Design a protein around this ligand. Structure first.
Ligand SMILES: *[C@@H]1O[C@H](CO)[C@@H](O[C@@H]2O[C@H](CO)[C@@H](O[C@@H]3O[C@H](CO)[C@@H](O)[C@H](O)[C@@H]3O)[C@H](O)[C@H]2NC(C)=O)[C@H](O)[C@H]1NC(C)=O
Ligand SMILES: *[C@@H]1O[C@H](CO)[C@@H](O[C@@H]2O[C@H](CO)[C@@H](O[C@@H]3O[C@H](CO)[C@@H](O)[C@H](O)[C@@H]3O)[C@H](O)[C@H]2NC(C)=O)[C@H](O)[C@H]1NC(C)=O
Ligand SMILES: *[C@@H]1O[C@H](CO)[C@@H](O[C@@H]2O[C@H](CO)[C@@H](O[C@@H]3O[C@H](CO)[C@@H](O)[C@H](O)[C@@H]3O)[C@H](O)[C@H]2NC(C)=O)[C@H](O)[C@H]1NC(C)=O
Ligand SMILES: *[C@@H]1O[C@H](CO)[C@@H](O[C@@H]2O[C@H](CO)[C@@H](O[C@@H]3O[C@H](CO)[C@@H](O)[C@H](O)[C@@H]3O)[C@H](O)[C@H]2NC(C)=O)[C@H](O)[C@H]1NC(C)=O
Ligand SMILES: *[C@@H]1O[C@H](CO)[C@@H](O[C@@H]2O[C@H](CO)[C@@H](O)[C@H](O)[C@H]2NC(C)=O)[C@H](O)[C@H]1NC(C)=O
Ligand SMILES: *[C@@H]1O[C@H](CO)[C@@H](O[C@@H]2O[C@H](CO)[C@@H](O)[C@H](O)[C@H]2NC(C)=O)[C@H](O)[C@H]1NC(C)=O
Ligand SMILES: *[C@@H]1O[C@H](CO)[C@@H](O[C@@H]2O[C@H](CO)[C@@H](O)[C@H](O)[C@H]2NC(C)=O)[C@H](O)[C@H]1NC(C)=O
Ligand SMILES: *[C@@H]1O[C@H](CO)[C@@H](O)[C@H](O)[C@H]1NC(C)=O
Ligand SMILES: *[C@@H]1O[C@H](CO)[C@@H](O)[C@H](O)[C@H]1NC(C)=O
Ligand SMILES: *[C@@H]1O[C@H](CO)[C@@H](O)[C@H](O)[C@H]1NC(C)=O
Ligand SMILES: *[C@@H]1O[C@H](CO)[C@@H](O)[C@H](O)[C@H]1NC(C)=O
Ligand SMILES: *[C@@H]1O[C@H](CO)[C@@H](O)[C@H](O)[C@H]1NC(C)=O
Ligand SMILES: *[C@@H]1O[C@H](CO)[C@@H](O)[C@H](O)[C@H]1NC(C)=O
Ligand SMILES: *[C@@H]1O[C@H](CO)[C@@H](O)[C@H](O)[C@H]1NC(C)=O
Ligand SMILES: *[C@@H]1O[C@H](CO)[C@@H](O)[C@H](O)[C@H]1NC(C)=O
Ligand SMILES: *[C@@H]1O[C@H](CO)[C@@H](O)[C@H](O)[C@H]1NC(C)=O
Lengths: 419, 136, 134, 136, 418
């Protein structure tokens, strides 16, 4: 309803940025790397997840997976505070390939993919793996239920899938979790990619370039397609599981996504890990097929090494990129906020950026010094009738010492140009 | 910052026996420029693989090595910036750490016909291999 | 819906000479939020009057102008939603219609001592007047 | 950012009569790449002058115009980044401000023999003039 | 004493603070306050800047402010600039250039005044006038004309201007940085001619290096850096001498600086030609004016054109930014400077503490993009600790009025504290 804040192009914004340090634990071991953080906020409660590994920051290469439940609380500070309520380690952490958080009805829900094979997505199938829901609330002990993938229905001949993303969504009794699927046949079309007027590589044709750019980079015979999983149930009973693929309109290689409930709509985000290096996001129109109204963003990108750096546009067999959530601020003005990386090819210099689809409105660096950051996530909410946001950054400020993500809270500026 | 590495058969830094060794400290910048259209029109097309020392000796790659960057366009200045931080925007993580070894090669035939030749190629013929022992 | 108008002396939309003009069509929503407790604790106390253009220029109100909304509490975010329909749940009707002028101001001193000051105040010092030609 | 302007006789953006007009707002970036060694080896040598509208129409420069940038090297991709701020690291200040006009041309013959020829040249033959009315 | 961070580290805490009460605030938004200069000596400073109408060019200025002040402890554990006197130059509308010197706890301003804004391209110094304006906290300013007629020169100079960010007082002698003009090539260039760079097809390196010293607007004139030594008997019997800089490692004429720091005399020369690395050094001999040039491989400056940041090879180039340095430790060869972290644009100022061969540590001034055309830095001992004050020629509000900014900061006591 009410929305009072800066909605114009301006400089020197006052986000009133403050870092929160008491939520995420501090490990005494310097060799442990805490990586790939996830955070989902809903109805004043949050669910935080991160991975802990020994001398390696790879996600499935992790011996511990932390699951935190908490609440948003006013401390009279004129700003929202994170109150950590419960903190547990996942019972199958050393076999976790991926997890996705959902805060439903003021409680935490974690959807994880467990496998004996760290390369399960390249040489195995989902019948060989297991998928779990770990759910809990404040001080209650966590309970983990195995998802009956045998009684699962799919809209196509998928051979594998993993929960991959920064968050899911609760609608009534249904959970909607972002998922990346694997299929071993080329069932896709690429009118959007095939319409680009770019230099033709002398080797292959544009139709082949666009077909092949959807392939997995480690199994030339497999294709990674993004989608969603809809799980409806009768109070953890009589599970009904559905697997729907994303629209084939403006396809991009399988990548971690996100679903968020914001402003009465459902926003889907897909990290750009292929040739289209610009922001992939959109609101959900239909659920079958999963059709997000793709944005036409000409100003938001992400860094990456190789043939697809920041602002790269032309179709190319590319793989790589960073995950950088967005959060909508005003539906009518098409405004969004996101912690993006201000570098063409290196993952560094995070900047809080409030932007249009066509212009960047305002921005501020997170750190004055150069800061390594592999991924960011952002969630915004109403607090004291004012728009506040909390972001988590996968940081590496101490090179060689322990790695730990960072949480920042900031407010959208009420007026333009205040410093 | 460090000295960029022009990747062409006409680059002297590739020692005929020792390759190109660098001793970078953490937090250094390092570009790997693949060459523009050279004056004499000798079109140079390569495909660079992040590889292991064992497969660096044989100069062969299986499918698991990731095609780090490919030198497709002759006119456009294709490049590849590296900062030796831990977190990198590449698929498969590519943790740099310190006191490790990191080997980069290309197995490609000089032109695009053998662009994806993975058996031998420049890694042994011209020994255009970049080896990066961080530290020391 | 329309863009809400934060009612505080710290709002740029109030042009230094022209005030804040709005051209809303019928059936639009428009909130007028009176500010929360600001960070530096500068308590902002106002009393808003639905007024006529003639006394809106002179910035004076007699007893008949109706106190449209008063910003009593500093902590609680008191607000004021407007739909430009004809019927309104307010005393004295307040018919909006179309192609009319509607002026809202405050004659109050910044603090609670001059809360009910009706002679001059912010209407002329800061020209915080909302003028709405529908 | 803006679309960079490659400065060569083989660029369509140079309208045959109007040159290349741009309407940049303050705080915009704008590269002026002078071309690399082209494929067909047609070496392109120019010398660009920041100029005034009157002599941009007449296509003549005296000694007072400052050589803004010269396309010396054929192999190296020489370039020229512009931010339309007021302060610029150039000799003679070169304040940009807003709602002004800024004209950039070259009076040079295509090759190095007339590199410093300031009488006529490309300004009228090909009308390769960059005119930047900021604002509007 | 000398207890501070002397190693490569991240996240330095300079305790940076902006000073706003020193530089006046002009009521006219169209006026541009540009080209600031600041010189600190013995706890007193002299600040100078130019004011112009809808133009930030130095001689295109209708007012030139001259401020004298003092460093004072306010119990803040940091130095504050205390403005004592503030006057406008009596010949502001004719000022081509000025240089500040704080001598004996007083201010001295050495200015070049001319009716012709293009005097350096078509005239000579007999046609122009040169003045010393001097004052302190109590005395009214007095301006004396410099008798250039009674000047002795070490070469056949045809013109000169005081050009630089500051001067130096030694006894009864003033030593002011100056840029001279001469119309014949009397110079040698072993340093430029020794570079092994690609030879441009038009001319050879001896021609390239001879012509790169020419004025860009008078192909017949050459700009050579130097100093002017003015000795006098209490504003009486002036004795003026004009000496050129050493021919070792010549660079095109440009604004310089002389500073009294750490028992030494530091010379700085802005890099406005092809050698884009820091030209600075301590003074060995005075005739010829020989600074022991550094081999700095990490400090440069941005510029558009054929000589951007980190450019080394000789080329007929003109352009650059003025960025003072200040020495911190003589034994460790450490210096501090506010440089611009951009290849071609003048933006993103960064306080940089550096070696001759490595950058030690640095910090951005603003989180947002900031336009900055020139910086000057001066450091001094305060409460037995090293503090520095820098002035930046800023343009943060594009389109509105321009006014420089003053920052004070401390060299970090310990490394890596945030
Ligand atoms: C966010 O995107 C919207 C479009 O979805 C932009 O819309 C329009 O953008 C222009 C340019 O900034 C705004 O200014 C107008 O420019 C024209 C140019 O001729 C000028 O004649 C007008 O008087 C006006 O100044 C325009 O107001 C704006 N309109 C709307 C409805 O958004 C918008 O610019 C973007 N956001 C910002 C802050 O620019
Ligand atoms: C790349 O992905 C493809 C597609 O998933 C892999 O091909 C298929 O892998 C399955 C594994 O379940 C093979 O089927 C099984 O093979 C075992 C071997 O003993 C057999 O016991 C089972 O009854 C079943 O047949 C399947 O044959 C194979 N290909 C095809 C065409 O069906 C492939 O292995 C992956 N390669 C790499 C290098 O990752
Ligand atoms: C300032 O310049 C000097 C040279 O004039 C640099 O000298 C030396 O640089 C090395 C490399 O950073 C320093 O560390 C070395 O580390 C290895 C680690 O085992 C050690 O074995 C070496 O013996 C050496 O200590 C070295 O300390 C330094 N020289 C001295 C006398 O300390 C200097 O590094 C530059 N400044 C900084 C802060 O690096
Ligand atoms: C470029 O710089 C040179 C170096 O100063 C300039 O040389 C001088 O130019 C003037 C006129 O431009 C010459 O005129 C002289 O005027 C006096 C007064 O009538 C007369 O007595 C002399 O016989 C002569 O006619 C002057 O000779 C010449 N050289 C010197 C040493 O003064 C040149 O003018 C500058 N060119 C431009 C276009 O700025
Ligand atoms: C981004 O661009 C696409 C392509 O134009 C938009 O999709 C079209 O949206 C318009 C609405 O303005 C419809 O009339 C068209 O039918 C859509 N395209 C097709 C092929 O049906 C999309 O809406 C744009 N995103 C926005 C406006 O947010
Ligand atoms: C009347 O008041 C309105 C109030 O908004 C003015 O509308 C805006 O005026 C500003 C500055 O004058 C412009 O930047 C905006 O573009 C105007 N709004 C729109 C939608 O364009 C308006 O200018 C005033 N005067 C007139 C003659 O309308
Ligand atoms: C461009 O201008 C140069 C100027 O040097 C021309 O080169 C001269 O052309 C004249 C013809 O009028 C010859 O007599 C000279 O011998 C040439 N060289 C010199 C040094 O003067 C050139 O021909 C012009 N046209 C081009 C380069 O296409
Ligand atoms: C495969 O994974 C399941 C996960 O529950 C585990 O129970 C089983 O022991 C694993 N198989 C082997 C051989 O370890
Ligand atoms: C969550 O809220 C919905 C609201 O109708 C309710 O139906 C459901 O039982 C609640 N609990 C869960 C676990 O979904
Ligand atoms: C749902 O199932 C849980 C299982 O622990 C049970 O405690 C609860 O009573 C059931 N009903 C509701 C409404 O939650
Ligand atoms: C490289 O391999 C291809 C494979 O057929 C061959 O045709 C070519 O001659 C080889 N040499 C090159 C491209 O120089
Ligand atoms: C406003 O009016 C009150 C009425 O009592 C008076 O006390 C006060 O001084 C006036 N001015 C203010 C609050 O600035
Ligand atoms: C000026 O020069 C003359 C002769 O060159 C000399 O005698 C005199 O001492 C100098 N100084 C003054 C102040 O006249
Ligand atoms: C400045 O002080 C020194 C002290 O030795 C003195 O020699 C010199 O004459 C003084 N300058 C004046 C008085 O102008
Ligand atoms: C340039 O010459 C110097 C001295 O002759 C020499 O030390 C240096 O190595 C030369 N440069 C190159 C690139 O060889
Ligand atoms: C000048 O600086 C370079 C930079 O490394 C250095 O190699 C060279 O030895 C220095 N010259 C002298 C005489 O020290």
């Amino acid at each position: 309803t009410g929305k009072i804040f800066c909605k114009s192009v301006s400089k020197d914004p006052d986000f009133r940025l403050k870092q929160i340090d008491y939520v995420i634990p501090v490990q005494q071991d310097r060799s442990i790397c805490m990586n790939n953080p996830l955070l989902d906020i809903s109805d004043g409660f949050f669910t935080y997840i991160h991975y802990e590994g020994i001398n390696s920051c790879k996600k499935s290469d992790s011996f511990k997976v932390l699951l935190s439940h908490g609440e948003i609380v006013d401390r009279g500070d004129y700003r929202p505070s994170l109150y950590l309520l419960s903190s547990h380690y996942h019972p199958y952490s050393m076999q976790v390939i991926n997890c996705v958080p959902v805060t439903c009805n003021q409680s935490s829900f974690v959807f994880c993919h467990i496998s004996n094979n760290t390369k399960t997505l390249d040489n195995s199938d989902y019948s060989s793996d297991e998928y779990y829901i770990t759910y809990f609330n404040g001080i209650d002990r966590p309970k983990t239920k195995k998802i009956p993938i045998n009684n699962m229905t799919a809209d196509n001949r998928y051979i594998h899938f993993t929960f991959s993303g920064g968050g899911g969504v609760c609608l009534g009794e249904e959970f909607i979790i972002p998922v990346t699927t694997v299929i071993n046949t080329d069932v896709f079309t690429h009118d959007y990619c095939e319409s680009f007027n770019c230099s033709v590589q002398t080797g292959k044709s544009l139709k082949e370039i666009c077909s092949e750019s959807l392939r997995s980079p480690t199994n030339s015979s497999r294709y990674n397609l993004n989608g969603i999983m809809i799980i409806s149930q009768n109070n953890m009973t009589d599970f009904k599981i559905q697997l729907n693929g994303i629209t084939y309109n403006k396809l991009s290689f399988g990548s971690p996504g996100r679903l968020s409930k914001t402003l009465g709509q459902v926003l889907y985000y897909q990290s750009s890990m292929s040739w289209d290096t610009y922001l992939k996001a959109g609101f959900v129109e239909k659920w079958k097929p999963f059709t997000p109204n793709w944005m036409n963003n000409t100003v938001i990108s992400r860094p990456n090494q190789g043939n697809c750096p920041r602002y790269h546009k032309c179709p190319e067999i590319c793989y790589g990129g960073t995950y950088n959530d967005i959060a909508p601020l005003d539906l009518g003005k098409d405004m969004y906020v996101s912690v993006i990386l201000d570098s063409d090819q290196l993952a560094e210099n995070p900047e809080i950026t409030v932007f249009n689809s066509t212009t960047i409105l305002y921005k501020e660096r997170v750190s004055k010094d150069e800061l390594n950051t592999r991924s960011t996530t952002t969630s915004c909410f109403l607090f004291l009738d004012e728009p506040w946001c909390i972001s988590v950054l996968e940081t590496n400020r101490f090179n060689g010492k322990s790695i730990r993500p960072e949480i920042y809270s900031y407010k959208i500026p009420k007026y333009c140009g205040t410093k | 910052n460090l000295e960029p590495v022009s990747w062409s058969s006409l680059n002297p830094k590739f020692l005929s026996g020792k390759g190109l060794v660098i001793y970078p400290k953490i937090g250094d910048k390092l570009d790997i420029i693949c060459p523009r259209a050279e004056a004499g029109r000798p079109y140079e097309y390569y495909k660079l693989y992040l590889v292991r020392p064992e497969q660096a000796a044989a100069c062969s790659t299986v499918l698991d090595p990731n095609v780090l960057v490919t030198c497709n366009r002759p006119e456009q200045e294709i490049r590849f910036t590296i900062k030796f931080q831990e977190f990198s925007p590449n698929y498969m993580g590519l943790e740099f750490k310190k006191h490790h070894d990191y080997y980069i090669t290309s197995t490609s035939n000089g032109s695009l016909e053998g662009l994806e030749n993975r058996e031998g190629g420049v890694c042994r013929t011209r020994t255009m291999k970049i080896i990066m022992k961080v530290g020391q």
